[PDB]
């Protein structure tokens, strides 16, 4: 019969403005704390003791330069719980030690779990297939590989991305100079999936909007659609002929078309995640050995591949002393790699 | 350059000379292509989730659609009923024409700004420069993440085209 | 021997052949540089 | 250039094995009914 579990199930699944669900018990606290943690840190909290950086509006940063920065390298991979052995329950010290970083990363991870459970739960209630939850596995693979696996393979959370606009840009440039990440075929597949997904988004939207049937008298054509109508609002047959004659091939099956729109960006993000798992271990696509053997013996042999390595060497030497303060690097002027004049 | 590694060379030098990552037109470009990929996966997943049953368990559901059939092959009312509950009702498109216009406009506008980013950095109006923007009471520089970006950019700058510069400023 | 009632025919249409060959060939064009190293 | 000597057969089998899988499946579809 209707026990307390079923009575609770009733209330959780009420059709209200913001659906709750069983998944909401996990999703809403964790999403709220991750977002609230980020807003709290970027507004008020420094990175002076972990990075030697200002990182909050309170210190004078703007929206592009605020961040919640990773903990000091000496923390290792500490969970850095507020009640843990590092902060010992002291909220102020916890903030100064980087506790908001693991707070956001961990509540964010469980919030993402809660969101994907929500996608399953709602799909089951309204009676649709759960492909939206399936497609969301790609955001999850990215978050887990970049914010958890990658630093877990490295020396500490310090080398995870810090949560901020400019901080993420630094992460990109670090990956170029140290990992040569642009050369990695798993990143290249990710790029193809993202740009190919954006291409499909644009071309499908434009094709539908330009093969519409005239279903009203208005020159603005949005009102000539009824959600309950049975008929296609655009001509698949005309769309197919156009693209066949323009590009050589065209979709003819709308079910395949829309599955392909799931497949392409979702697969790309999954591939990029695999490459980052490799970079967790410094298992890079850094070099082509045949190129290096030839270049070492032949000082006239030059390609764009060898040119980019010189850029990477500059990035490493010029950014490492300030970007890795725990190493206490001191690079005398005379050892810095530089071309002529610059 | 017309090549894969030559493309990366162009990007890295562009960052050194224009700080493109800190330029809002490139940031709009990223929103355009990340968003385009997101909405591609979203639209694909929502239409696929609401395909009307026309096939058996042992055949591809794609045979449930026939080229040129007049009826829609998925239930947009079900798809909206799902997505409107995922977020909230008024954050979801119930008008297929509005939806597909949005799918066109978001990546197209974002990539227009990407193109305009490159085309205006072509005339050296560059990304935001916050180098040494934060200063303490004495005047010590307090670094931000922008200053760390600057160190990386410098490494690119001093090394690129290592034999081509004779004078101290790279003015083009 | 009595036949198995669970057997099913398998299909691959021409478009799927073309899509699959494109995937394989492009993956090969991509990964071959790293195989030769 | 001093390339990896297994790269040629790696690339050749990478192409051939899944391609022939697909060709086998395609041709036996055409020959049905």
């Amino acid at each position: 019969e209707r026990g307390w579990f079923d009575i609770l199930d009733d209330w959780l699944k009420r059709d209200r403005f913001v659906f709750v669900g069983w998944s909401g018990i996990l999703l809403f606290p964790c999403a709220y704390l991750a977002l609230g943690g980020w807003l709290t840190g970027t507004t008020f909290v420094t990175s002076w003791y972990t990075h030697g950086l200002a990182s909050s509006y309170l210190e004078g940063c703007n929206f592009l330069t605020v961040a919640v920065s990773t903990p000091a390298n000496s923390m290792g991979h500490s969970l850095l719980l507020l009640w843990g052995p590092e902060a010992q329950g002291d909220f102020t010290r916890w903030c100064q030690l980087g506790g908001l970083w693991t707070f956001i990363a961990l509540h964010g991870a469980f919030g993402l779990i809660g969101f994907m459970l929500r996608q399953f739960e709602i799909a089951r209630l309204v009676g649709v297939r759960p492909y939206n939850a399936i497609a969301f596995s790609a955001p999850i693979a990215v978050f887990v590989s970049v914010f958890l696996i990658y630093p877990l393979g490295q020396s500490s959370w310090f080398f995870a991305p810090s949560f901020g606009v400019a901080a993420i840009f630094r992460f990109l440039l670090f990956f170029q100079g140290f990992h040569n990440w642009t050369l990695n075929p798993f990143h290249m597949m990710g790029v193809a999936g993202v740009l190919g997904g954006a291409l499909l988004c644009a071309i499908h939207g434009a094709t539908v909007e330009n093969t519409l049937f005239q279903d009203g008298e208005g020159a603005s054509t949005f009102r000539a659609f009824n959600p309950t109508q049975a008929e296609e609002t655009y001509s698949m047959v005309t769309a197919n002929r156009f693209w066949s004659q323009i590009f050589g091939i065209a979709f003819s099956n709308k079910r395949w078309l829309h599955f392909f729109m799931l497949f392409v960006p979702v697969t790309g993000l999954w591939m990029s995640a695999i490459g980052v798992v490799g970079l967790a271990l410094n298992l890079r696509s850094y070099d082509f050995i045949s190129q290096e053997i030839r270049a070492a013996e032949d000082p006239e042999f030059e390609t764009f591949y060898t040119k980019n390595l010189l850029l990477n060497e500059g990035i490493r030497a010029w950014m490492a002393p300030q970007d890795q303060p725990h190493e206490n690097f001191v690079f005398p002027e005379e050892v810095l790699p530089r071309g002529n004049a610059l | 350059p017309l090549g894969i590694s030559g493309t990366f060379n162009f990007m890295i030098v562009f960052q050194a000379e224009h700080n493109i990552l800190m330029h809002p037109f490139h940031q709009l470009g990223v929103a355009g292509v990340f968003g385009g990929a997101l909405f591609c996966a979203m639209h694909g997943s929502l239409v696929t989730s609401s395909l009307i049953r026309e096939t058996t368990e042992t055949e591809s559901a794609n045979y449930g659609y026939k080229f040129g059939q007049e009826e829609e092959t998925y239930n947009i009312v079900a798809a909206h009923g799902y997505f409107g509950r995922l977020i909230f009702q008024y954050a979801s498109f119930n008008n297929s024409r509005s939806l597909h216009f949005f799918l066109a406009a978001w990546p197209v506008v974002g990539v227009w700004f990407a193109a305009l980013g490159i085309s205006t950095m072509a005339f050296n109006l560059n990304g935001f420069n916050f180098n040494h923007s934060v200063i303490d009471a004495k005047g010590n520089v307090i670094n931000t993440w922008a200053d760390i970006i600057n160190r990386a950019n410098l490494g690119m700058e001093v090394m690129h085209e290592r034999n081509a510069h004779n004078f101290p400023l790279d003015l083009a | 021997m009595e036949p198995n009632p669970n057997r099913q025919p398998v299909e691959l249409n021409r478009t799927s052949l073309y899509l699959g060959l494109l995937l394989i060939l492009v993956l090969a064009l991509l990964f071959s540089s790293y195989f030769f190293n | 250039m001093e390339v990896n000597q297994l790269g040629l057969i790696a690339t050749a089998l990478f192409v051939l094995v899944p391609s022939v899988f697909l060709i086998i499946l395609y041709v036996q579809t055409e020959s049905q009914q």
Partner: peptide
């Protein structure tokens, strides 16, 4: 052997384009 391999794969792709376009399964209104 590397160059032959790269150009061979590329040539197969171009041939595939030709067949995918001119010898496609024709779209038919059902």
């Amino acid at each position: 052997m590397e160059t032959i391999t790269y150009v061979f794969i590329f040539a197969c792709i171009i041939a595939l384009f030709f067949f995918a376009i001119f010898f496609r399964e024709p779209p038919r209104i059902t």
